[PDB]
Structure formats: structure tokens, C-alpha cells
Paper text:
[name]-2.1 is composed of three subunits, [name], [name], and [name], and shares the latter two subunits with the nuclear pore complex-associated [name]-2 complex. Cryo-EM structures of [name]-2.1/[name] and [name]-2/[name] identify a conserved trigger loop in the [name] and GANP subunit of the respective [name]-2.1 and [name]-2 complex that is critical for [name] regulation. [name] contains an N-terminal motif (NTM) and two RecA-like domains (RecA1 and RecA2) that form the ATPase core.
Data processing yielded two major classes: [name]-2.1/DDX39BNTM-N and [name]-2.1/[name]. A 3.08 Å cryo-EM map of [name]-2.1/DDX39BNTM-N complex reveals an asymmetric V-shaped architecture of [name]-2.1 and that the NTM-N of [name] binds to the [name]/[name] interface. First, [name] is significantly shorter than GANP, with the lack of a GANP N-terminal region (GANPN) that is involved in [name]–RecA1 interaction. Comparison of the [name]-2.1/DDX39BNTM-N and the [name]-2.1/DDX39BNTM+RecA1 structures reveals the structural flexibility of [name]. Upon binding to [name], the N-terminal helical domain of [name], located at the interface of NTM-C and RecA1, swings towards the RecA1 domain of [name].
Residue numbers in the entry:
A (entry chain B): 4 to 398
B (entry chain C): 17 to 66
C (entry chain D): 10 to 14
D (entry chain A): 575 to 800
Write the structure that this text describes.
Amino acid sequence: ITINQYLQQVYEAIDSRDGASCAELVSFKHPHVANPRLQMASPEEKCQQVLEPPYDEMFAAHLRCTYAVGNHDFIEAYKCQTVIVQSFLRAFQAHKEENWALPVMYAVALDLRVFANNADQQLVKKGKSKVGDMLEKAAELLMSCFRVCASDTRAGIEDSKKWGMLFLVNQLFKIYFKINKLHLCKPLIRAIDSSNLKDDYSTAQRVTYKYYVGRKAMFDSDFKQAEEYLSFAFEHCHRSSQKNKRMILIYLLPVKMLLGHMPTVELLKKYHLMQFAEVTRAVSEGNLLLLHEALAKHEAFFIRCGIFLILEKLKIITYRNLFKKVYLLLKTHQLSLDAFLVALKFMQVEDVDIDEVQCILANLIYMGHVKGYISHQHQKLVVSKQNPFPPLSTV
Amino acid sequence: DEFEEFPAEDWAGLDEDEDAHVWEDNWDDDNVEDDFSNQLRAELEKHGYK
Amino acid sequence: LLDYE
Amino acid sequence: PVAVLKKSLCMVKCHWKEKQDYAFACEQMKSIRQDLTVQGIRTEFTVEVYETHARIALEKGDHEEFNQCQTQLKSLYAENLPGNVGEFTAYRILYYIFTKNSGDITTELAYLTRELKADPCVAHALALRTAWALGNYHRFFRLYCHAPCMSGYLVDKFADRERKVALKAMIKTFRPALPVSYLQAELAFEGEAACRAFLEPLGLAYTGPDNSSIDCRLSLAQLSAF
């Protein structure tokens, strides 16, 4: 296909206000990238003489960018994509009370982020810069896009640019989850909640937003909200995209286990997350030795997933289950602390003394896991006649 | 790796793989006759505490 | 001993 | 003046060791650091001077100066420069515990290697972090007693906070009275006077004029005060 035909198609799509065709002609998912005729070095004259600005600069930059990616010049590709996003945002804020060009943004925005990653990887291979150099600039550009999309308050909701909000937020989250900067997600999370379209977005963007917010809440020890979000993200996830469902389970399992819900063996085997299996078997049993062995054996996987320190908080649940087992076996409301000391020594915990047992029981009672009090003079934990160990859901 | 991009932007509910009862909350009960509890009971009985 | 209240 | 600046660092180290004056030592070392930055020196001697300044700042208790020093020293260690990498990897974890930066601790633990975990300071810091995360004040203060190198200076900053949390958890459980001797033994207190001065401002009601123990039941209302 000659570049004249491509320019004519671009002009027809722009003049007809058809977002889908214009987005296709500028997105790298389209096969036209692979066309050798399309890739050219300096097609700026053709774009200038065919398309009015700022579309001319945007599409000339896109053509040189596809040439660069054909030559694998990812730094030049990222620079050209930044030029594309700037010119398109100018032409996008140009539109008044119309969001025909909303799909275009999506494609363009996505491409930028992807290129940024490769750019950073290139700078890792070249050794010039560190990791995340271009990702912050990518996040800045996407934040400008988000501001433009959220500024459209006067226009009617049918043709407002607010519909292009959540997608951009999701993109930002990805960057903010690759450079390990969670705090920057704080404004966006409220910005979505302020909008009245919090539930009117597409299913994919809503699911991605719920998953990211659930991850942030879990990392902030907000397991109730984290469960409320990740359950929705995992329930509404697309069946075809199994990788996303597994990634959501990776962060939903610790929250459910901390709140007292244990995954079945079938769920772990189905999604190939067998690494949790033994861990689960410990927590529901009160086996501290098994929990330590399973956390050490799968230490690398949990360290990579970033949930090792969240997983280690299951030791409190393991303590509660072990002490509940001791209470059930002894069948007495007034339990000598030496019984819990014996149980702890059975789990091969290093240098356990009665003082550590008292400390663990005091922490459990303070946290609400146990309803009782430890008489120190007699060294006896007196537990309640009714509801000695309340269910983990209420705690 | 990172969260993927869904192929279809909207899919209603027919494409939502529904997992039924994958979470159990009945583990927390008075069941104290399994293998691990029997081992712990033997260990405790070795030091008294009938 | 008195029980927890 | 790069080679003789090592002798200058030795001189200021002697000044800190004998005179024990933080003002002149800190000022001179800040000037030394800014002289190093101007020349762009990033060798092992830069690691040495940053380590010395951080260790000096820890003794005075100025956590902000130490925070800047360790933040720059992470970048200095990133380029595999010889030095006490374990000692100052422990202090990063301790400062993250002090500032309750739970997000930073995960990333810091991710990059830990076997050699670092074998270091006594890193092992002590990791054990202290585990005890603090699980709320095990007995093990926490047992580790806080025998702290290696300068690792105790970081823990001295949130020792009072953890002591208040532990005392809340103790009063909530220990009934009808909590012996003050047990409180001073478990919370890693030296002398009875220190423990008495610690628990006096809380306004807890005791059991009798002798104050042999604190009355938890009548002090439950004071838990929200501290």
C-alpha cells in the first residue's frame, strides 16, 4: 500500500470523526506497521501537505516511529511516540463537547507505555541509565492525558471525555506498580471515586482498576477493602485471560487466608498456584513447623511476588489455631501456660520460654483473637466460658 | 511480569469463569481428631495434661 | 479463679 | 586535596572519639562530603567517609542526617564498592521499622543475598523486624538488649513506642494486677527507677500505696491516653 493511500485513509477517518479507524491507523496492533512501504524516514512533507496540523506532525512522527521500530531504535521510537502523544493531546483538547477521538487516545497511550519499557530496557543494556528513567516521563504524559479527560465537566455525559478516565488511570497504575511508587496512586483512587461514572466504565478497565486498588489496599494492611476489591476483580475477570486471573489470585489468597477463608486444593491446582498449598495446610492446622518449611522452600516465589511479608502475618493465625487445638484437647477454661509452652516446643521454635508464651498470648488477646486473661501469679490463662476464640471474620 | 490487557473491552458475564466454593470457612471448628492434632495430643500427654 | 468478663 | 583528605578524616574521627563534640565534627564532615561531591569522587573512600558520618550521626541521635547518609550510601553500594555492606544494610531495615515504611521493607528484603543474611548485623535486624511485625515484644526486647555494633541506636528511637504498645497489650490481658517487676524485666529496663519513670506519666492506677503492681482493671480507661 502506497503512503498516499495511507494518508488519504487517515484524512478520511479524521474528517469523518470515526474514532475506530483513526485509532487503527495509528496503533501498532494494526498490520500496517509491518508493511515496508509504510515505514519511511522523513515523510513529514506528505503529512504536511495532506493533513492539517496537529495531525500532520502526529502521523509523520508515527511513520518515523514505525520505521524506527522496524530498525529496533527504541529510544527514537519512544521520542516519536512522545511527540505523537503531545500533538494528539493538543488536537484532543481542541475538540469541544465531542469525544469521537477517544479510542485513538487509548491506542496511542498504550503504545507509549510499551515503548517506554523497551526504552528503559535498552538503557539497561547500554548501561547509560538506570531502570525507570523513561517510565516517570511516561507517567507524566499519561497524567496530563488524565487531566484533559477529567477536565471535561461542562460537556454532557453522553459525549464527555470522562469516559477516557479509568483507562488512563489503569495505565498510570501499571507504571506506578513497576517503579514501586504506590503513594502516587492515592489521588487517582479518589479521583475515580469523586466521579459519578465509577460503575459506568467498561468491564476490563473496571476489573483492572479494582485489582490494582485491591493490591494497594493489601499492601497497606486494609484487608477488608482489599478483599472487597480483589474478589470483584477475580470474579469478573475474563475467562480467556487466565494469566490475569492467576495474578489476581496471587494477591487475593493472602487476604482471604488472613481473614479466615482458606482456598481449596482444586483452586490452587487449577491456576497452578500450588506454592500456597502447603502454606494453607499449615494455617488451617496450626502447624508452625510446616508453615516455616513451606515459606522457606517457596521463599523465592513469594519474594518475587512481593507478598512474603504479608504471608508471614499468617503466623498469628497459626498461633491462634495451635492454641485453639491445645484448648480443645485439654477441655479446660483455665489453661496452664506450660501446656502452650510444650506445644510451642513441639513446633521446634528456637529457645522458647514461658515469657514468650505469655507475650504471644497477650498479643493474641489484645488483637481480639482470644477472649481471656492471663493470671501471672498462678501463670494460668483463664478464657471465657462462651466464645473463647471468636471467628476470624468478626476479628 | 505485569497485568495483561483484556482482549475484549466488555464481555458481560458469559465470559466470566465462575469458580464455585473455592473458599472454605468450615475448617475452623472443633475437629481435633485428625493426624496433626493426634500427634500434638501425644506430645502434650508425654508431659501430663490428660 | 474468676472467669473473664 | 584527595589523598590528604584521608588524614583529615582520621583527624576528625579522633576529634569525635575524644572530644565527643557533634557540632564541629558534623560541620567538618559535611564540608568534606561537599568537597568530595565537587570533585566527583565515587571510590571506596567515599563509602568510608559516608559510613563514618552516618555512624557519628547515629550516636548523637539525629536520624535525619543518618537518613540522608544511608540514602546516599545505598547508591554508593549499588556499584559494588567494598565496605561494610551488611552493617548498613541492617540500618536500612532498622530505619524502615522506625518510620513504619512497610513498603520499603519488602523491596529491601527482596535484594538480600545469602552473604548479607549471614552477616550478624543483618541477621539481628531481620530478627528484630520479624519480632516487631508479629508484635512479639519479648523477643523484640531480648534482641534489643544485645544489639550488635551501632544497631541499638536505631532501636532506641522506637523502643518507647514499642514499650507503650506492649504495655497496652499487657494491661489488656494481665489481670487483676500486673507486677511492675515483671514489666521492667520483660520490657528490657535497667533499674527500677527507669521503669517507674516510664509508667508514671501514664496515670495508671496501682494496687496499694506501695505500688507493688499496677491495677489493670482501673487503668483500662487510661489506655486511650497513651
